[PDB]
């Protein structure tokens with residue numbers, strides 16, 4: 001699939017950089033024709049078939065295909081795609097309140113945690129309903145619309161590892177951030193929607209305590225901890241956290257993906273359900 005090959009600069013002006021990573025940079029931008037504002041993600045293309053630099057066309061096209069399917073208040077939306085020799089440029093919905101990660105570093109109560117979590121669960125319910133696994137859920141990939149409100153609204157971003165799961169599972173080169181990946185990722189096993197639910201358990205633990213449940217001193221330690229389900233609720237952090245909140249986490253941080261709560265289970269769980 002090919003994208004718009006006119007110069008993006010003829011249609012958009014860029015401004016503040018919103019973030020950067022491995023082979024991508026995200027810039028605030030404004031469409032010249034409408035004055036409307038967006039986030040432009042510049043993704044570096046591979047220059048040869050065997051290069052390890054840049055993102056493969058196959059991987060770029062998958063991400064764009066997934067983004068085009070999505071329309072839900074809790075997930076980022078895609079406006080347009082451009083490309084040139086060096087980059088694919090995604091013109092994405094602008095979200096200005098920063099990462100949930102940075103909002104967290106600034107300070108949650110169970111109410112504040114569930115307020116965020118319900119939105120995340122709603123977005124993931126939408127995705128999983130469409131058989132889309134995100135595969136990279138973490139606080140860095142949850143953005144706030146406006147961070148100066150008591151209960152900020154959120155949108156899930158970064159579908160770079162996302163996959164359609166038409167056959168119950170996928171087994172591919174898929175591996176996210178060690179702190180948040182499920183044991184089946186660590187062990188290179190077939191992956192399905194269940195992996196996202198584990199990641200939600202990790203996010204929930206962090207929301208409530210400020211601490212990361214499997215984090216070791218090195219990446220290999222973290223991964224070893226994940227595979228062994230080596231976590232516990234520290235009393236210093238969880239002493240005034242409800243047993244029901246702990247129950248919710250405990251039913252997500254389960255090694256056997258078949259025994260893990262599904263997204264539907266999570267919405268019916270007594271900590272979440274009205």
Ligand SMILES: O=c1c(O)c(-c2ccc(O)c(O)c2)oc2cc(O)cc(O)c12
Nearest residue numbers: 018019026039093094095157158159160
């Ligand atoms: O940092 C951002 C980011 O990474 C992405 C993003 C979204 C979907 C993807 O599939 C993807 O690869 C990246 O969107 C954004 C949108 C914003 O308004 C602001 C941002 O800072 C980001």
